[PDB]
Amino acid sequence: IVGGYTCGANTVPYQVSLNSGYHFCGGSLINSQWVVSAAHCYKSGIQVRLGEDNINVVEGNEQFISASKSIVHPSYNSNTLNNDIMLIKLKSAASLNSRVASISLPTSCASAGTQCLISGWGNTKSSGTSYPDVLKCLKAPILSDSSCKSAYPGQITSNMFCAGYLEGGKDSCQGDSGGPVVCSGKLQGIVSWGSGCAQKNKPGVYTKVCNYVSWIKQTIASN
Amino acid sequence: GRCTKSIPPICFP
Ligand SMILES: [Ca+2]
Ligand SMILES: [N+]
Ligand code: NA
Ligand code: NA
Ligand code: NA
Structure with missing residues (x-):
């Protein structure tokens, strides 16, 4: 920004970080087990980091949960960027609280x-x-x-x-x-x-x- | 120029 x-x-509290040994994209928590992000952020090895402020320090309130499904829109067009949306299912549900919320x-x-x-x-x-x-x-x-x-x-x-x-x-x-x-x-x-x-x-x-x-x-x- | 906002960016001519 x-x-x-x-x-x-x-x-x-709905902001997530997508992490692959570094922050590479954001996302938004929409229920305890699903995140919305961009199709062009798809990769293997996504760990979703919830509850973050300082992404380089374990401060408290973090939840690190692996993606179990990464679902790029089937009609995503990588040249025009039309349909630039992806759903990520979390391997386990996040614990919702005031700092981790949909x-x-x-x-x-x-x-x-x-x-x-x-x-x-x-x-x-x-x-x-x-x-x-x-x-x-x-x-x-x-x-x-x-x-x-x-x-x-x-x-x-x-x-x-x-x-x-x-x-x-x-x-x-x-x-x-x-x-x-x-x-x-x-x-x-x-x-x-x-x-x-x-x-x-x-x-x-x-x-x-x-x-x-x-x-x-x-x-x-x-x- | 025209680029996605990922790390790294994906850019277009
Ligand atoms: Ca942190
Ligand atoms: N404009
Ligand atoms: Na419906
Ligand atoms: Na300018
Ligand atoms: Na990347």
């Missing part, structure tokens, strides 16, 4: 201008790299479809939206992929892609979770 703030320990799925899509909370352990610099120990947060609005498409012509599918800013300085960045965009208490987005981070006229692009609620429910029910 570039241009954000330190969230504070466990203030985003986030609700949308009942409808969000409107432009709604303020959302974007969070993660990604790079905090728009030029160069700095990876934070503790979770970072950014308040950011949903952009209109027409402005999103103006910024990224021919690339924004019906399963994407833009959020953030156009003046530069505030965005998600590398290492934030897969993590949450939460707007009035609903998981509306998954950090996906952009042209750089925090660049003028190049807002972040996010998977539109409201299009996948039925797919998520059907997939969880069958697994």
Whole structure:
């Protein structure tokens, strides 16, 4: 997250870190045994780390649980990034508490201008790299479809939206992929892609979770 | 340029 703030320990209790001997992507806990992340974050060897603040220190409140299922959307397109969503089933259920909590799925899509909370352990610099120990947060609005498409012509599918800013300085960045965009208490987005981070006229692009609620429910029910 | 926000990024020309 570039241009954000330190969230504070466990203030985003649905935020998970996906770990393979290092943090590589975020995710969002949606029930005690399932996490939403991005399709492009799929790999072998995923350990889900719940309850984290400082990802480099065992502070208390962590739960480390292996993925037992990693389910990339069957129609994920790795060149266009359409359908950039993955479900992870945890090998055992997480112990839910005030520091480890699920986030609700949308009942409808969000409107432009709604303020959302974007969070993660990604790079905090728009030029160069700095990876934070503790979770970072950014308040950011949903952009209109027409402005999103103006910024990224021919690339924004019906399963994407833009959020953030156009003046530069505030965005998600590398290492934030897969993590949450939460707007009035609903998981509306998954950090996906952009042209750089925090660049003028190049807002972040996010998977539109409201299009996948039925797919998520059907997939969880069958697994 | 156009890149995913993973470690490492996946980028497109
Ligand atoms: Ca920790
Ligand atoms: N725009
Ligand atoms: Na810029
Ligand atoms: Na259903
Ligand atoms: Na990786």
